[PDB]
């Protein structure tokens, strides 16, 4: 088979390729932070990196962070409006390969 949009002589990659955005919360939502212990996302991120950085591919690490933040956390507030709220991190990947911090 053949086409007009594949197998180019001069190989190029998108300028937007190889970027990974590890957002703390879902698009359009607030992000929670404990005035004492820190943000839910960073706490969870660091904790999962210290435990899996030398064992899991990055996306899988970030997936544990998602579960950790989503299950182990719920906001507390004197204002009913901001009380008992939840959060789900948002992994946005445009990487073209797997990422292991070890080798």
């Amino acid at each position: 088979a053949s086409g007009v949009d594949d197998d180019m002589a001069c190989h190029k990659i998108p300028v937007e390729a190889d970027f990974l955005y590890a957002y703390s919360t879902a698009p359009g939502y607030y992000s929670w932070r404990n005035s004492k212990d820190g943000s839910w996302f960073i706490q969870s991120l660091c904790a999962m990196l210290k435990q899996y950085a030398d064992k899991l591919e990055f996306m899988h690490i970030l997936t544990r962070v998602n579960r950790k933040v989503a299950t182990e956390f719920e906001s507390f507030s004197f204002d009913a409006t901001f009380h008992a709220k939840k959060q789900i991190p948002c992994i946005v990947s445009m990487l073209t390969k797997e990422l292991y911090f070890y080798h």
């Binding site: 990659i13 998108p14 300028v15 937007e16 390729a17 190889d18 970027f19 990974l20 955005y21 590890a22 957002y23 703390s24 919360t25 879902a26 698009p27 359009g28 939502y29 607030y30 992000s31 932070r33 404990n34 005035s35 004492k36 212990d37 820190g38 943000s39 996302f41 960073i42 706490q43 991120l45 660091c46 990196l49 210290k50 950085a53 591919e57 719920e74 409006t81 901001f82 008992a84 709220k85 939840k86 959060q87 789900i88 948002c90 990487l95 390969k97 797997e98 990422l99 292991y100 911090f101 070890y102 080798h103």
Partner: protein
Amino acid sequence: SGISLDNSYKMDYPEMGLCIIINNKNFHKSTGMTSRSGTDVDAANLRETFRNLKYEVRNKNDLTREEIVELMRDVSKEDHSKRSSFVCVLLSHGEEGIIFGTNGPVDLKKITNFFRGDRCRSLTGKPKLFIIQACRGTELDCGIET
């Protein structure tokens, strides 16, 4: 040699790469924004965590929108030839596609364009990571019982 797959990024360069941490806690009163207590815990936790991953950690506290842009531009113009990747952590107030300097907002797009494949050649083909602790809107998740 044998079968070479290349399904994972080459992470065995002399250096793992830079880990720029922008920790914005205190904002200018003129913005009406409050201080983000607990953020220093995040910053120190990130420094320690990435330090053990062998990243060259650089922390910056309470930067203005201009300083943020100048920092990112300067760093993007460094020679990353010997580095495997690039990490940038942004801890601050924000909105969708926006990160707050101590005196004003900064479009994330403006920060990340400096590292676009064609503007930062020494990072081309290398993983460029942006960890972002900040609001992306004003919606609240009420969750559901499991």
